[PDB]
Every structure is written in structure tokens, then in C-alpha cells.
Write an enzyme that holds these catalytic residues in place. Structure first.
Site, PDB file in Angstrom:
ATOM      1  N   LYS A 121      24.605  51.504  22.865  1.00 53.47           N
ATOM      2  CA  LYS A 121      25.800  50.665  23.051  1.00 53.47           C
ATOM      3  C   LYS A 121      26.024  50.300  24.522  1.00 53.47           C
ATOM      4  CE  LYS A 121      25.956  51.382  18.756  1.00 53.47           C
ATOM      5  NZ  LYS A 121      24.649  52.117  18.867  1.00 53.47           N
ATOM      6  N   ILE A 138      25.919  46.633  26.184  1.00 51.58           N
ATOM      7  CA  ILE A 138      27.091  46.116  26.911  1.00 51.58           C
ATOM      8  C   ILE A 138      26.729  45.673  28.330  1.00 51.58           C
ATOM      9  CG2 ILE A 138      29.340  46.770  27.922  1.00 51.58           C
ATOM     10  CD1 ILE A 138      29.643  48.527  25.260  1.00 51.58           C
ATOM     11  N   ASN A 139      25.808  46.411  28.943  1.00 54.65           N
ATOM     12  CA  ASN A 139      25.232  46.085  30.242  1.00 54.65           C
ATOM     13  C   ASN A 139      24.764  44.639  30.354  1.00 54.65           C
ATOM     14  OD1 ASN A 139      24.215  46.692  32.899  1.00 54.65           O
ATOM     15  ND2 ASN A 139      22.160  46.834  32.020  1.00 54.65           N
ATOM     16  N   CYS A 171      40.066  50.721  42.776  1.00 51.89           N
ATOM     17  CA  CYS A 171      39.850  49.271  42.916  1.00 51.89           C
ATOM     18  C   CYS A 171      40.913  48.470  43.625  1.00 51.89           C
ATOM     19  CB  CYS A 171      39.641  48.596  41.563  1.00 51.89           C
ATOM     20  SG  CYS A 171      37.945  49.076  40.910  1.00 51.89           S
ATOM     21  N   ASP A 220      27.813  48.733  45.285  1.00 54.59           N
ATOM     22  CA  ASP A 220      28.056  49.301  46.611  1.00 54.59           C
ATOM     23  C   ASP A 220      28.296  48.184  47.624  1.00 54.59           C
ATOM     24  OD1 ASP A 220      27.264  51.581  45.213  1.00 54.59           O
ATOM     25  OD2 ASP A 220      25.267  51.632  46.121  1.00 54.59           O
TER      26      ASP A 220
END
Lengths: 379, 379
Positions: free
Chosen positions: B38, B42-43, B143, B203
Site C-alpha cells: 500500500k 501510494i508513493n 512543518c 531534505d
């Protein structure tokens, strides 16, 4: 500047670890060794009678087959640390006579947790602070965090002054270090190095309210006026003092240079602080001995070093000694504890020459090495 | 307010990873499982072409028997992350035409390291900044850190304004998330939870200089003027978004609620931002579509959600798309990267209806859930 500390609150946990606490835990989890014997010996002449803690030596967290992981530490920081921070903050706000809606900013510190959301979120929520509250959670600074939070809050207060807005800042420090006893014991035993952290560090939450004076309850009472501050970093001293993240929490870094570096910094920092306000101070407040000193008691030699370098008696730092002997070094939370204790009647009785001072120098050192100094006028 | 962004700098690491990178590492370290399948699926649904990384899939740190410990992560944060922060800061200072001694404060953020001294110390030292520099290292916010640091810097600038002093603040974000791939993979396999963090995070380091204009000559150039800001916490949403400390670093917390809660917060936050400064804005800047939108691209649904909620085209957030597709979500470092990219010529070429906007809305969400917005005027 119109900056005043209008309330202080301090909440130690209920429990006190005597010097035998580490003896008990050491014998329970490690064989006898030369390095452990050395630490247990040093423990007996730190000058600390009792270290405040979230638990006794039989606490489940420190009695697992392995030391608790940084995750397991976090769980207890949240269950046992956060309530202290909530109570300390409540006490500060109560003395300042403020309701939750009046709090405009929060500046918080700790070096004994990492979390997202940070612990300040949970404290603010419990207090019922605004959903628009501006928060700062400081990291990276350890023992100096209290005075760094205060100075940061001062700058933030003035930012609201610029815009003609009231500012009431909850300035908060929470440290839970005693839970890392198993981590330190493992390092002592495995590395055979003398690590004195477990002999010094304790748990506490403390808070102050810093107001910018705008829209204050007029005739506005305060406990201390914040007149000035100095901050400095000692170059090439990173390796001398530190707290390194680890699967077991954070590992204490402490070199032989720390007492001398700390002591040698007092003269220039003090001079810099006074030069920035010498026309504001009366001629009765010129040399170190003229002031009361709210020193962060990092260890016994920090206090004795200050006495020597600045020509002070132990009574000049009477509140520092009082916290140190009876509660130990609670990292960033100690300094507000000292300031709270200083203005109490039983400390007045111990003032040098029966002279309670109107001006108070606050001082702290931590990883960096960072030096913090502030000047307060006591009401 | 006299607040202006006078320089910006961004430094991505050397490597750019396609979706096959996590395929490689997953297969190397874990048998196929329903949850892993999964996540790997989804990646490829994210719309991210490449993620910026300090390393490639052969990096030693992510190829040990176990995932790297939080200590081992810290070592690479210092060796491979700090240089990015130094270079980003250098470029921001260079654009602002500022030498080290001119920097008065530093406001830094990261959620992918813990250290004492904090990483900001080492960056500041490498830059040769003042031994009296006032530093703030933010924690707890993930974030939203870039915009949170900016707003904190704004308040600090105004504190100096209150005192008639020049303020030049280095505002810095550094995140190294890709090194936590093994930790995430381990949780996916062991817990059989669909953890999508490894599909998203990258990064980066990015920096801006925020000045308070005091001590600047008349007619001094700037890139953006900072006019106002809003910050809110969405109630009862702590469990929806987080980053929990762990012996393996930090574990992502991410619920299916996040895009919905985020989308819902835009209109009310925007309305409050705009009403606070509507009198300062011309008639042509009255509605959401009137502005350029520097959105933090937390996920594809955040961008499409903003388009839906505020009635915008993708071109309104063209720099957000550019960052997201070509570099991924670099947590707190992404927003300054977006603001830097927005003012480049090839972005001007994609401006909705050929109109490069004079006013820019900045927006970011993170653990809290914290919402941050700012209004910038583009010179």
C-alpha cells in the site's frame, strides 16, 4: 522599558531523592566497579541534601530490565511533568491576577523532552489559553533556558510595545531529569567514566509572567522590574558542556573546564550589564557585593566560584543555596524557583548585613557555553 | 511596521531521488506485506517527481543491520545538514548585503534533530556571527516552522524597533528527514500501518533575512515587505499530526483527517488576515484570487484543497507546485524555498492571467494542528 515580572509560580514534584537513591539503583542494576564507586563518593559532597523527583527509587520507569527509551521517557514527561508546568503557570497567573484570555505569548523551555506538538501546547490547552496564543518552545540551551526564555520574552513584550498592544507573557520552564538515572548508570558502568550528572540533577517546573506594562491594572503592582540583560557565548566551549540525544534520552557532557570558564565570565558579563544602564542605578548599587544574586546553582563550585571572583558571601546567593541544597539542580526551571524564593520572608532574614537589596542580578550558564545575566529591580 | 525580507537563500542537498529509491530500500530490508505494498503504491500517487536528499539509497546510515539510532541520525544531521544551513544563510546574507557583525538575532527551526548546543550554534559559528547574537531555536512545530520562525522574527524585530535599534534577523530552517526512511519502513512492516511519510518528505535548508529597517539608508531594496500575520490552533487535532521522539529518531503521526481540517481552516484564517490589513491594500487586492499564494505543499491534497476552498488556479500557487514536484515536502524548510522560487523569472511567466501579484499570502500547517499565514508585499 516598562517590563515587569508580575507573578511567579513554582511546582516541584512531591518526591525527594536522598543521596542513597543512586546507591540503591546502582547496586540493583550494576556490579560494583571503580568508576561507580567514584561517582557514589562524589555524590556525598555535592552539597545537595535532597533532589526533587517525579518518583522514588522504586518508580516503575527506572526499574525495567533496561533503561527506559527516549519514547518511554517522553510518556512520563507528559504524564508527570506537564501537570507540574500547568500548576506552576496557574500560580504565576494567579499572582499576576490574569485570566487565560489576557495571555498574549508563551515562551517555554526544556531540554528533557522532544515532541511535536511540544509540551507547551498541552500546558496551554489545560490552562485554556487562546487558540491565537503566540508560542515559542526553545531548544538546544539546557540550564540557561530560564533566563534565555525571560530575555526572549522581554524582546517579544517590546514587539507588542512597538504596536501599542498589551503583552502578558507566560514564561515557562519544565525539566524532568531524574528519569534518566538508568541511562547515566549504564554509561558509568560500561565506559568506566566518572559521570556526576546523577548526583546533581532534579525535576521542577517554574514560571513567571512578564508584562509590557501597557493596559496594566493601573498603579500596577509587580514583583520585579526587568531593567536589562546580557547574553554571550564562550567560543570553543561546545565540547565542555552538553546534552546529546540518545536512544536512552540525552547524555550529559561535562568537562573539567566548566567551573573555571563559568567563574571567569562573571566579571566581563557583569561589567557589560552595568555599562548598559549605569545612569539608571543609584550610586548605592555599583559593585557586585551591592546586589542580591540570583545565581543558577549548576553545582557547588559555581556558587563558590562566584563568591571568589565577585567578592560575594554565600548569603548574597542565599536563595540559590536554598534551592540547591534542598532540591538540587533542576536545569532551566531552577532560576525562577530562586527568584520566587528570594522574595520570601525567611530569605529576607538571611540577607548580607541584614540588608535586603533593591536590585538583583540573575545569572545562568548552560550548553554553548551560553552565559545569561539579567538586572532586576525588586519591588 | 517597517519589516522587510532583504535576502533569501536556499540549499538543497546533492541527491534527487525518484519514487524507486524507497522501492530499493524496502525490498532490501523487508519482505513484501499488505501495508508495505500500500505505501509503495501510494508513493506513486503523490505527484512528486523527485525528493531532495543528503544521500542516495546506498548511504551507509540507512544500510546498517538496524535503522540508525537517534544519536546516529544526529551525527549525519550535523555532518550533512548543517553545511546546507550554512550555505543557505550565506546566500540570504549576501543578497541582503550584510556582513556577520550586522546580524542581531537568529531564529532557527528544525524537527529532525535534538542537540545541546542546538544546531543553530554551529551554523552561527561557521558564519562568524557575534558572540552576543540573540538566538531562538524553535521546537515542537514541524512543518509550520518556517512561517512560525518568520512571525517570531517579526515580533523580535519590533522589540528592537521599540528601542530604536537596528534589527537584522537570520531566519533559518533545516530539515533532514530522508535518513529516517529505515525507521518508517520498520514501522510499516511491523505494525502493518500505511505510513506515507517516506513518500513525501525530503531534505533542505532555507533562510531569509528579516530587517526592521532601522539603520537602513533611504531607498534600500527589499524582496518582500512583511505586512501582517495570523496564527491559530485547530481545536482537538493533536492526534491528527505529530512527530514523536523515538530511539529510532521521530515517528510520523498522520491521520486521514488532516487534509479536511486544513482545507477548512483556510477561509476563516484568510478572512482574519485580510480584515486586519484591508485598509492598507488597494482595490485590486480584495479577494483570494487577487493574490499570489505561497502555500507550504504538505501534500498534493493541500494544494488542490486550497484551490477548491479559496477558488484558485494551480498557477496561483505555481512556486508551491514547483517545489513539491521537483523536491518534495522539506517540512519547515519548504516555505522559504517557495518564496525564493516565486520571485524568479520563470515563475513570473506562469503568473495567472500574466499578472505577477504585488501581494502574496503565505500559508503553512503543522503539528498542533497549527496554522500560520502571512501577508507579504512584493517589491
Amino acid at each position: 522599558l516598562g517590563l515587569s515580572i508580575t507573578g511567579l509560580g513554582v511546582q516541584y514534584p512531591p518526591y525527594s531523592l536522598g543521596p542513597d537513591a543512586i546507591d540503591i539503583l546502582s547496586k540493583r542494576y550494576h556490579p560494583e566497579s571503580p568508576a561507580m564507586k567514584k561517582v557514589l563518593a562524589i555524590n556525598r559532597y555535592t552539597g545537595i541534601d535532597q533532589r526533587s523527583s517525579i518518583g522514588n527509587p522504586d518508580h516503575p520507569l527506572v526499574n525495567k530490565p533496561n533503561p527506559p527509551t527516549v519514547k518511554e521517557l517522553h510518556e512520563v514527561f507528559m504524564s508527570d511533568g506537564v501537570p507540574l508546568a500547568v500548576e506552576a503557570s496557574r500560580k504565576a497567573m494567579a499572582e499576576a491576577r490574569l485570566v487565560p484570555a489576557q495571555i498574549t505569548h508563551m515562551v517555554s523551555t526544556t531540554c528533557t523532552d522532544s515532541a511535536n506538538p511540544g509540551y507547551d501546547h498541552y500546558v496551554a490547552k489545560e490552562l485554556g489559553l487562546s487558540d491565537r496564543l503566540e508560542k515559542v518552545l526553545l531548544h538546544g540551551i539546557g540550564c540557561s533556558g530560564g533566563l534565555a526564555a525571560l530575555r526572549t520574552a522581554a524582546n517579544l513584550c517590546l514587539g507588542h510595545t512597538a504596536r501599542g498592544k498589551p503583552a502578558r507573557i507566560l514564561v515557562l520552564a519544565l525539566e524532568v531529569s531524574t528519569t534518566m538515572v538508568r541511562s547515566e548508570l549504564e554509561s558509568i558502568d560500561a565506559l568506566q567514566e566518572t559521570r556526576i550528572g546523577i548526583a546533581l540533577f532534579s525535576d521542577c517546573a517554574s514560571a513567571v509572567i512578564l508584562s509590557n506594562g501597557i493596559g496594566e491594572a493601573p498603579g500596577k503592582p509587580a514583583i520585579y522590574d526587568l531593567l536589562g540583560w546580557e547574553n554571550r557565548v564562550i567560543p570553543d566551549s561546545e565540547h565542555d558542556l552538553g546534552f546529546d540525544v540518545d536512544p536512552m534520552g540525552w547524555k550529559v557532557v561535562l568537562s573539567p573546564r566548566v567551573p573555571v570558564l563559568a567563574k571567569a565570565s562573571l566579571q566581563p558579563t557583569y561589567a557589560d550589564l552595568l555599562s548598559s544602564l549605569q545612569d539608571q542605578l543609584p550610586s548605592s548599587y555599583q559593585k557586585p557585593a551591592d546586589f542580591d544574586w540570583a545565581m543558577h546553582p549548576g553545582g557547588a563550585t559555581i556558587l563558590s566560584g562566584a563568591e571568589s571572583a565577585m567578592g560575594l558571601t554565600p548569603e548574597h546567593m542565599r536563595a540559590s543555596y536554598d534551592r540547591y541544597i534542598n532540591h538540587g539542580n533542576s536545569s532551566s526551571a531552577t532560576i525562577f524557583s530562586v527568584l520566587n524564593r528570594l522574595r520570601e520572608k525567611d530569605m529576607d532574614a538571611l540577607a548580607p548585613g541584614g540588608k535586603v537589596k533593591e536590585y538583583v542580578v540573575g545569572c545562568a550558564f548552560g550548553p554553548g557555553i551560553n552565559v545569561e545575566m539579567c538586572m532586576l529591580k525588586r519591588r
